[PDB]
Amino acid sequence: TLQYRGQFDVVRPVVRKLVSEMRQNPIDVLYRPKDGARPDAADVLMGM
Amino acid sequence: MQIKTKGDLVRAALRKLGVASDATLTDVEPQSMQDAVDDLEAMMAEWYQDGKGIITGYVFSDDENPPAEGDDHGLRSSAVSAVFHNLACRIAPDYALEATAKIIATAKYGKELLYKQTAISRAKRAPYPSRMPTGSGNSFANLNEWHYFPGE
């Protein structure tokens, strides 16, 4: 047969909301010098 | 089946009515029997309304093959009782008679049972309308949005 098979989505708006929420706050690495090391020991690595 | 022609159907109707039988010392004339065969043919044609009525398998006699009596009625095994009960009811007024209550009830029940299977087969649903989509669940994959294939 075929019969009617409609799709009335109600979870896609939630997925879009969560994706946009996680996209509004970007996150990346941040290299920090170890304790007892030079205060600037991470600048070269961070720049690279 | 022991009943196999229109003549046997008419004889069974007469036996049920009590007018004539294999036991009676008097019998009906062949002209009366022929008239009863004509009554049966008319009744069956009125029922089987050129294909849109009760389907029974009845085989209509032709004018070239002379005696309508003696032609096999062509009915199934399960239709004989209903057909000859209804025939007895129809032809009873010829003999200043009135088919009794049991005969009437059996004729009604038999006609119902005759039409039951045809009614079940004729109770069908029309296809989907012309402005109905077929939904995303079908429309994905093959991109079909308005067909509603009549395959099954």
PDB file of C-alpha atoms in Angstrom:
ATOM      1  CA  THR A   1       0.000   0.000   0.000  1.00  0.00           C
ATOM      2  CA  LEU A   2       1.097   3.558   0.633  1.00  0.00           C
ATOM      3  CA  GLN A   3      -1.074   5.165   3.366  1.00  0.00           C
ATOM      4  CA  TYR A   4      -0.426   8.650   4.753  1.00  0.00           C
ATOM      5  CA  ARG A   5       2.853   9.076   6.637  1.00  0.00           C
ATOM      6  CA  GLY A   6       3.228  12.669   7.746  1.00  0.00           C
ATOM      7  CA  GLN A   7       6.131  14.098   9.725  1.00  0.00           C
ATOM      8  CA  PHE A   8       5.282  16.913  12.154  1.00  0.00           C
ATOM      9  CA  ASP A   9       8.649  17.567  13.743  1.00  0.00           C
ATOM     10  CA  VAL A  10       8.876  18.727  17.352  1.00  0.00           C
ATOM     11  CA  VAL A  11      12.466  17.782  18.273  1.00  0.00           C
ATOM     12  CA  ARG A  12      14.284  19.695  15.523  1.00  0.00           C
ATOM     13  CA  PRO A  13      13.547  23.105  17.136  1.00  0.00           C
ATOM     14  CA  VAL A  14      15.114  21.781  20.348  1.00  0.00           C
ATOM     15  CA  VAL A  15      18.153  20.494  18.463  1.00  0.00           C
ATOM     16  CA  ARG A  16      18.577  23.853  16.710  1.00  0.00           C
ATOM     17  CA  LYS A  17      18.283  25.675  20.028  1.00  0.00           C
ATOM     18  CA  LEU A  18      20.965  23.486  21.609  1.00  0.00           C
ATOM     19  CA  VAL A  19      23.269  23.811  18.593  1.00  0.00           C
ATOM     20  CA  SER A  20      22.954  27.602  18.606  1.00  0.00           C
ATOM     21  CA  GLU A  21      23.502  27.729  22.368  1.00  0.00           C
ATOM     22  CA  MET A  22      26.715  25.738  22.025  1.00  0.00           C
ATOM     23  CA  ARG A  23      27.767  27.855  19.030  1.00  0.00           C
ATOM     24  CA  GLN A  24      27.351  31.182  20.841  1.00  0.00           C
ATOM     25  CA  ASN A  25      30.103  30.199  23.331  1.00  0.00           C
ATOM     26  CA  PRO A  26      33.212  29.065  21.439  1.00  0.00           C
ATOM     27  CA  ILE A  27      35.900  27.169  23.334  1.00  0.00           C
ATOM     28  CA  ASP A  28      39.563  26.613  22.491  1.00  0.00           C
ATOM     29  CA  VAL A  29      42.840  25.560  24.090  1.00  0.00           C
ATOM     30  CA  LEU A  30      44.746  27.901  26.404  1.00  0.00           C
ATOM     31  CA  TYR A  31      48.323  27.007  27.319  1.00  0.00           C
ATOM     32  CA  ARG A  32      49.446  28.162  30.752  1.00  0.00           C
ATOM     33  CA  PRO A  33      52.984  27.939  32.167  1.00  0.00           C
ATOM     34  CA  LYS A  34      53.650  25.309  34.798  1.00  0.00           C
ATOM     35  CA  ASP A  35      54.361  26.302  38.377  1.00  0.00           C
ATOM     36  CA  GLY A  36      58.021  27.147  38.879  1.00  0.00           C
ATOM     37  CA  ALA A  37      58.529  27.751  35.150  1.00  0.00           C
ATOM     38  CA  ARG A  38      59.111  31.046  33.376  1.00  0.00           C
ATOM     39  CA  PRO A  39      56.106  33.401  33.374  1.00  0.00           C
ATOM     40  CA  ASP A  40      56.238  33.479  29.545  1.00  0.00           C
ATOM     41  CA  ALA A  41      56.934  29.775  28.900  1.00  0.00           C
ATOM     42  CA  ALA A  42      53.680  29.266  26.945  1.00  0.00           C
ATOM     43  CA  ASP A  43      53.644  32.211  24.524  1.00  0.00           C
ATOM     44  CA  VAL A  44      55.452  30.494  21.631  1.00  0.00           C
ATOM     45  CA  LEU A  45      53.268  27.387  21.824  1.00  0.00           C
ATOM     46  CA  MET A  46      50.109  29.476  22.166  1.00  0.00           C
ATOM     47  CA  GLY A  47      51.033  31.595  19.151  1.00  0.00           C
ATOM     48  CA  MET A  48      51.774  28.532  17.033  1.00  0.00           C
TER      49      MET A  48
ATOM     50  CA  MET B   1     -26.705 -32.460  -5.948  1.00  0.00           C
ATOM     51  CA  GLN B   2     -29.944 -34.253  -6.793  1.00  0.00           C
ATOM     52  CA  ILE B   3     -31.454 -30.973  -8.036  1.00  0.00           C
ATOM     53  CA  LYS B   4     -29.677 -30.047 -11.259  1.00  0.00           C
ATOM     54  CA  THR B   5     -32.071 -28.325 -13.693  1.00  0.00           C
ATOM     55  CA  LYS B   6     -34.715 -25.623 -13.686  1.00  0.00           C
ATOM     56  CA  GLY B   7     -37.277 -28.406 -13.859  1.00  0.00           C
ATOM     57  CA  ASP B   8     -35.964 -29.865 -10.613  1.00  0.00           C
ATOM     58  CA  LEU B   9     -36.026 -26.424  -8.996  1.00  0.00           C
ATOM     59  CA  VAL B  10     -39.673 -26.004 -10.004  1.00  0.00           C
ATOM     60  CA  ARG B  11     -40.533 -29.519  -8.816  1.00  0.00           C
ATOM     61  CA  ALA B  12     -38.927 -28.803  -5.448  1.00  0.00           C
ATOM     62  CA  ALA B  13     -40.929 -25.582  -5.143  1.00  0.00           C
ATOM     63  CA  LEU B  14     -44.144 -27.472  -5.904  1.00  0.00           C
ATOM     64  CA  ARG B  15     -43.191 -30.173  -3.393  1.00  0.00           C
ATOM     65  CA  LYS B  16     -42.635 -27.573  -0.676  1.00  0.00           C
ATOM     66  CA  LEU B  17     -45.940 -25.897  -1.497  1.00  0.00           C
ATOM     67  CA  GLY B  18     -47.679 -29.277  -1.357  1.00  0.00           C
ATOM     68  CA  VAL B  19     -49.208 -28.929  -4.822  1.00  0.00           C
ATOM     69  CA  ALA B  20     -47.347 -31.790  -6.492  1.00  0.00           C
ATOM     70  CA  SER B  21     -44.611 -34.275  -5.659  1.00  0.00           C
ATOM     71  CA  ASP B  22     -43.374 -37.775  -6.408  1.00  0.00           C
ATOM     72  CA  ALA B  23     -45.879 -39.069  -3.831  1.00  0.00           C
ATOM     73  CA  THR B  24     -49.066 -37.261  -4.854  1.00  0.00           C
ATOM     74  CA  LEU B  25     -51.645 -39.127  -6.902  1.00  0.00           C
ATOM     75  CA  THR B  26     -52.148 -35.988  -9.025  1.00  0.00           C
ATOM     76  CA  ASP B  27     -49.574 -33.808 -10.769  1.00  0.00           C
ATOM     77  CA  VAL B  28     -49.468 -30.445 -12.509  1.00  0.00           C
ATOM     78  CA  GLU B  29     -49.747 -30.088 -16.265  1.00  0.00           C
ATOM     79  CA  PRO B  30     -46.627 -29.464 -18.379  1.00  0.00           C
ATOM     80  CA  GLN B  31     -47.972 -26.045 -19.355  1.00  0.00           C
ATOM     81  CA  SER B  32     -48.150 -25.110 -15.681  1.00  0.00           C
ATOM     82  CA  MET B  33     -44.621 -26.422 -15.177  1.00  0.00           C
ATOM     83  CA  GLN B  34     -43.382 -24.384 -18.147  1.00  0.00           C
ATOM     84  CA  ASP B  35     -45.060 -21.288 -16.712  1.00  0.00           C
ATOM     85  CA  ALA B  36     -43.264 -21.942 -13.425  1.00  0.00           C
ATOM     86  CA  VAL B  37     -39.970 -22.169 -15.333  1.00  0.00           C
ATOM     87  CA  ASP B  38     -40.774 -18.798 -16.906  1.00  0.00           C
ATOM     88  CA  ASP B  39     -41.470 -17.403 -13.435  1.00  0.00           C
ATOM     89  CA  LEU B  40     -38.089 -18.688 -12.257  1.00  0.00           C
ATOM     90  CA  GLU B  41     -36.314 -17.153 -15.247  1.00  0.00           C
ATOM     91  CA  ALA B  42     -38.000 -13.796 -14.646  1.00  0.00           C
ATOM     92  CA  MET B  43     -37.170 -13.903 -10.928  1.00  0.00           C
ATOM     93  CA  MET B  44     -33.525 -14.718 -11.571  1.00  0.00           C
ATOM     94  CA  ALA B  45     -33.237 -11.973 -14.188  1.00  0.00           C
ATOM     95  CA  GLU B  46     -34.805  -9.491 -11.765  1.00  0.00           C
ATOM     96  CA  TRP B  47     -32.323 -10.546  -9.076  1.00  0.00           C
ATOM     97  CA  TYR B  48     -29.222 -10.608 -11.304  1.00  0.00           C
ATOM     98  CA  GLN B  49     -29.755  -7.044 -12.485  1.00  0.00           C
ATOM     99  CA  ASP B  50     -27.608  -7.343 -15.609  1.00  0.00           C
ATOM    100  CA  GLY B  51     -24.552  -7.955 -13.443  1.00  0.00           C
ATOM    101  CA  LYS B  52     -25.216  -5.386 -10.701  1.00  0.00           C
ATOM    102  CA  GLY B  53     -27.426  -7.592  -8.544  1.00  0.00           C
ATOM    103  CA  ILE B  54     -27.115 -10.922  -6.754  1.00  0.00           C
ATOM    104  CA  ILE B  55     -24.415 -13.031  -8.406  1.00  0.00           C
ATOM    105  CA  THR B  56     -25.424 -16.695  -8.313  1.00  0.00           C
ATOM    106  CA  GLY B  57     -23.946 -18.390 -11.379  1.00  0.00           C
ATOM    107  CA  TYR B  58     -27.398 -18.902 -12.886  1.00  0.00           C
ATOM    108  CA  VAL B  59     -27.229 -19.802 -16.578  1.00  0.00           C
ATOM    109  CA  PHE B  60     -29.998 -18.212 -18.628  1.00  0.00           C
ATOM    110  CA  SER B  61     -31.705 -20.452 -21.165  1.00  0.00           C
ATOM    111  CA  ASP B  62     -31.655 -19.474 -24.833  1.00  0.00           C
ATOM    112  CA  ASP B  63     -34.487 -19.598 -27.345  1.00  0.00           C
ATOM    113  CA  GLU B  64     -32.555 -21.779 -29.804  1.00  0.00           C
ATOM    114  CA  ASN B  65     -32.085 -24.689 -27.384  1.00  0.00           C
ATOM    115  CA  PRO B  66     -35.803 -25.320 -27.151  1.00  0.00           C
ATOM    116  CA  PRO B  67     -36.807 -26.601 -23.680  1.00  0.00           C
ATOM    117  CA  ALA B  68     -35.848 -24.200 -20.913  1.00  0.00           C
ATOM    118  CA  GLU B  69     -36.702 -26.995 -18.508  1.00  0.00           C
ATOM    119  CA  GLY B  70     -33.837 -29.454 -18.473  1.00  0.00           C
ATOM    120  CA  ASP B  71     -31.153 -26.790 -18.738  1.00  0.00           C
ATOM    121  CA  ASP B  72     -28.753 -26.957 -15.813  1.00  0.00           C
ATOM    122  CA  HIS B  73     -29.424 -24.019 -13.519  1.00  0.00           C
ATOM    123  CA  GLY B  74     -25.688 -23.559 -12.970  1.00  0.00           C
ATOM    124  CA  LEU B  75     -26.178 -22.514  -9.351  1.00  0.00           C
ATOM    125  CA  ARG B  76     -23.729 -23.540  -6.675  1.00  0.00           C
ATOM    126  CA  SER B  77     -24.671 -26.166  -4.112  1.00  0.00           C
ATOM    127  CA  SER B  78     -25.440 -23.546  -1.463  1.00  0.00           C
ATOM    128  CA  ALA B  79     -27.894 -21.529  -3.598  1.00  0.00           C
ATOM    129  CA  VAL B  80     -30.393 -24.279  -4.439  1.00  0.00           C
ATOM    130  CA  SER B  81     -32.417 -24.024  -1.234  1.00  0.00           C
ATOM    131  CA  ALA B  82     -32.748 -20.241  -1.364  1.00  0.00           C
ATOM    132  CA  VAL B  83     -33.648 -20.257  -5.051  1.00  0.00           C
ATOM    133  CA  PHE B  84     -36.382 -22.860  -4.852  1.00  0.00           C
ATOM    134  CA  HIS B  85     -37.835 -21.444  -1.622  1.00  0.00           C
ATOM    135  CA  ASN B  86     -38.132 -18.038  -3.281  1.00  0.00           C
ATOM    136  CA  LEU B  87     -39.638 -19.703  -6.354  1.00  0.00           C
ATOM    137  CA  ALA B  88     -42.257 -21.445  -4.215  1.00  0.00           C
ATOM    138  CA  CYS B  89     -43.130 -18.088  -2.667  1.00  0.00           C
ATOM    139  CA  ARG B  90     -43.396 -16.429  -6.086  1.00  0.00           C
ATOM    140  CA  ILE B  91     -45.560 -19.111  -7.720  1.00  0.00           C
ATOM    141  CA  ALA B  92     -47.871 -19.841  -4.772  1.00  0.00           C
ATOM    142  CA  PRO B  93     -50.397 -17.125  -5.813  1.00  0.00           C
ATOM    143  CA  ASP B  94     -51.024 -19.033  -9.059  1.00  0.00           C
ATOM    144  CA  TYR B  95     -52.656 -21.858  -7.087  1.00  0.00           C
ATOM    145  CA  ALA B  96     -54.833 -19.622  -4.877  1.00  0.00           C
ATOM    146  CA  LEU B  97     -52.288 -20.334  -2.151  1.00  0.00           C
ATOM    147  CA  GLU B  98     -50.097 -18.463   0.313  1.00  0.00           C
ATOM    148  CA  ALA B  99     -46.588 -19.667   1.111  1.00  0.00           C
ATOM    149  CA  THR B 100     -46.481 -20.510   4.785  1.00  0.00           C
ATOM    150  CA  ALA B 101     -44.484 -18.684   7.438  1.00  0.00           C
ATOM    151  CA  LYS B 102     -41.584 -21.145   7.482  1.00  0.00           C
ATOM    152  CA  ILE B 103     -41.232 -20.933   3.702  1.00  0.00           C
ATOM    153  CA  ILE B 104     -41.201 -17.126   3.863  1.00  0.00           C
ATOM    154  CA  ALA B 105     -38.575 -17.125   6.619  1.00  0.00           C
ATOM    155  CA  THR B 106     -36.376 -19.600   4.754  1.00  0.00           C
ATOM    156  CA  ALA B 107     -36.632 -17.544   1.562  1.00  0.00           C
ATOM    157  CA  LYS B 108     -35.585 -14.358   3.380  1.00  0.00           C
ATOM    158  CA  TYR B 109     -32.681 -16.065   5.144  1.00  0.00           C
ATOM    159  CA  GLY B 110     -31.556 -17.709   1.913  1.00  0.00           C
ATOM    160  CA  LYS B 111     -31.550 -14.465  -0.053  1.00  0.00           C
ATOM    161  CA  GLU B 112     -29.510 -12.806   2.695  1.00  0.00           C
ATOM    162  CA  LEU B 113     -27.023 -15.686   2.594  1.00  0.00           C
ATOM    163  CA  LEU B 114     -26.843 -15.509  -1.196  1.00  0.00           C
ATOM    164  CA  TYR B 115     -25.901 -11.845  -1.166  1.00  0.00           C
ATOM    165  CA  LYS B 116     -23.566 -12.035   1.852  1.00  0.00           C
ATOM    166  CA  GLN B 117     -20.318 -12.836   0.029  1.00  0.00           C
ATOM    167  CA  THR B 118     -21.027 -10.403  -2.802  1.00  0.00           C
ATOM    168  CA  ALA B 119     -21.723  -7.650  -0.270  1.00  0.00           C
ATOM    169  CA  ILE B 120     -18.466  -8.408   1.540  1.00  0.00           C
ATOM    170  CA  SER B 121     -16.583  -8.179  -1.756  1.00  0.00           C
ATOM    171  CA  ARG B 122     -18.405  -4.993  -2.782  1.00  0.00           C
ATOM    172  CA  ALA B 123     -17.630  -3.243   0.528  1.00  0.00           C
ATOM    173  CA  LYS B 124     -14.475  -1.558  -0.757  1.00  0.00           C
ATOM    174  CA  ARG B 125     -12.830   1.773   0.022  1.00  0.00           C
ATOM    175  CA  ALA B 126     -12.332   4.324  -2.719  1.00  0.00           C
ATOM    176  CA  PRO B 127      -8.724   5.407  -3.311  1.00  0.00           C
ATOM    177  CA  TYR B 128      -7.325   8.537  -1.705  1.00  0.00           C
ATOM    178  CA  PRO B 129      -8.731  11.867  -2.939  1.00  0.00           C
ATOM    179  CA  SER B 130      -7.090  14.092  -5.541  1.00  0.00           C
ATOM    180  CA  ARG B 131      -5.775  16.827  -3.216  1.00  0.00           C
ATOM    181  CA  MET B 132      -4.266  14.550  -0.541  1.00  0.00           C
ATOM    182  CA  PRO B 133      -0.463  14.443  -0.225  1.00  0.00           C
ATOM    183  CA  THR B 134       1.303  11.215   0.666  1.00  0.00           C
ATOM    184  CA  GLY B 135       3.385  12.636   3.506  1.00  0.00           C
ATOM    185  CA  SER B 136       7.081  13.032   4.169  1.00  0.00           C
ATOM    186  CA  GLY B 137       7.437   9.434   5.337  1.00  0.00           C
ATOM    187  CA  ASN B 138       6.680   8.231   1.816  1.00  0.00           C
ATOM    188  CA  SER B 139       7.932  11.311  -0.023  1.00  0.00           C
ATOM    189  CA  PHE B 140      11.505  10.860   1.098  1.00  0.00           C
ATOM    190  CA  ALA B 141      13.652   8.391  -0.877  1.00  0.00           C
ATOM    191  CA  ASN B 142      11.668   8.350  -4.133  1.00  0.00           C
ATOM    192  CA  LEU B 143      10.411  11.965  -4.009  1.00  0.00           C
ATOM    193  CA  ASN B 144       6.802  10.849  -4.513  1.00  0.00           C
ATOM    194  CA  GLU B 145       4.459  13.457  -3.091  1.00  0.00           C
ATOM    195  CA  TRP B 146       1.044  12.961  -4.702  1.00  0.00           C
ATOM    196  CA  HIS B 147       0.707   9.496  -6.247  1.00  0.00           C
ATOM    197  CA  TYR B 148      -0.727   6.947  -3.770  1.00  0.00           C
ATOM    198  CA  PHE B 149       0.078   3.963  -5.938  1.00  0.00           C
ATOM    199  CA  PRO B 150      -2.942   1.658  -6.428  1.00  0.00           C
ATOM    200  CA  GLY B 151      -0.827  -1.495  -6.360  1.00  0.00           C
ATOM    201  CA  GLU B 152      -2.267  -2.758  -3.075  1.00  0.00           C
TER     202      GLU B 152
END
